[PDB]
TrEMBL record:
Ranges of residues in domain DHFR: 3-214
Lineage of origin: Eukaryota, Fungi, Dikarya, Ascomycota, Saccharomycotina
TM helices/strands, residue ranges: none
A Gene Ontology BP annotation from the UniProt entry: tetrahydrofolate biosynthetic process
Pathway this chain belongs to: Cofactor biosynthesis; tetrahydrofolate biosynthesis; 5,6,7,8-tetrahydrofolate from 7,8-dihydrofolate: step 1/1
Keyword DNA repair listed: no
Native source organism of the sequence: Candida glabrata (strain ATCC 2001 / BCRC 20586 / JCM 3761 / NBRC 0622 / NRRL Y-65 / CBS 138) (Yeast)
CDD domains, sorted: DHFR (cd00209)
Listed GO CC annotations: mitochondrion
Protein name (record): Dihydrofolate reductase
UniProt-annotated binding residues for NADPH: 9, 17, 22, 54-56, 76-77, 96, 121-124, 127
EC number: 1.5.1.3
Molecular function GO labels: dihydrofolate reductase activity; mRNA binding; NADP binding
Amino acid sequence: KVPVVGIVAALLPEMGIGFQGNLPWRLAKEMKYFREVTTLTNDNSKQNVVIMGRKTWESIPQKFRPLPKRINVVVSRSFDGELRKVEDGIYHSNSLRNCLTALQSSLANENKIERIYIIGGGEIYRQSMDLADHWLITKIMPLPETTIPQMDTFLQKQELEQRFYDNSDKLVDFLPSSIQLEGRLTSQEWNGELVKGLPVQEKGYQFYFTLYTKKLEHHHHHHHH
Ligand SMILES: NC(=O)C1=CN([C@@H]2O[C@H](COP(=O)(O)OP(=O)(O)OC[C@H]3O[C@@H](n4cnc5c(N)ncnc54)[C@H](OP(=O)(O)O)[C@@H]3O)[C@@H](O)[C@H]2O)C=CC1
Ligand SMILES: COc1cc(-c2cc(C)cc(C)c2)cc([C@@H](C)C#Cc2c(C)nc(N)nc2N)c1
C-alpha cells in the first residue's frame, strides 16, 4: 500500500556503488538530492522510512545518524525480530522482508508513512529487486578527463532491466512536489547506452537523476477463496 522505492547512486556502465565500505565519490549535490527526496513528503503529517543494511549504517558518519526527519530501520541477522524500536528514530529488524510487511500494517503505521526508501547497500539492493515498486537511480559518469574510481560493489543491472523500465519522463512528477531540480530532462548517449533524466555536473562527474518503474505484468493467477 505504501510505495517501496530503492534509491541508489551508481557509476555507469557497470553500476558500481561502493569501494571498501565507502561511497566512491563525495558529491554534495547528489547527497542533497538523496537528503531532500528521502526527507520530503507531499503530506506534512507523514514521514518516510529509510531502510538500510547493518554495514551501510556503520558507514554513515556518527554525527549524522540516525538520518534526521525519517524513520531509520537497520537490518541485521543478529537482531531480535522483525521490527523493534531501539532508540529514538531507530528501529532494528532481523528481516528485510518481514520489516516491509510490518511497516505496511495500517494498524501499526496509522497511515503516517508516505514512502519506504531502501537506501543500501549492495546485499540489501540484491534482495530488493523483487520488492521495490520503483528505483530512483542517480547514473554517474566520469567526465572525459576523470579517472574512473575503483569499486567492489555493484547494482544488479541485469535484474533491473529485466523487471523495470526507464520511466525518467515521469521523474519530476514522482518526486515530492516541493523539491527543486536544476536540470531539464535530457537524453544522451554514453558508451553505447541511452541515459535519460535530470543532468548535473560536480567535480569530475556528470550525473543524471533517473526513475525506473516496474514493467507491466500479465494476469496469470489471482488468489481466490
Ligand atoms: N552508492 C550508493 O547509493 C550506496 C552505496 N553503498 C555501498 O554499499 C557497500 C555496502 O554494501 P554491503 O556490504 O553489501 O552491505 P549492506 O549495507 O547491504 O549490509 C549487509 C548486511 O545487512 C544485513 N542483511 C542483509 N540481508 C538481510 C536480511 N534479509 N535480513 C536481515 N539482515 C540482512 C547483514 O547484517 P549482519 O552481518 O549484521 O547480519 C549483512 O551483513 C558499501 O561500499 C557502501 O559504500 C551503500 C548505500 C548507498
Ligand atoms: C557508505 O557510507 C555512506 C555514507 C552516507 C553519508 C555520508 C555523509 C558524509 C553524510 C551523511 C548524512 C551520510 C550515506 C550512505 C547511504 C545511507 C546512502 C546513500 C545514497 C546517496 C548518497 N545517494 C543516492 N542517490 N542514494 C543513496 N542511497 C552511505
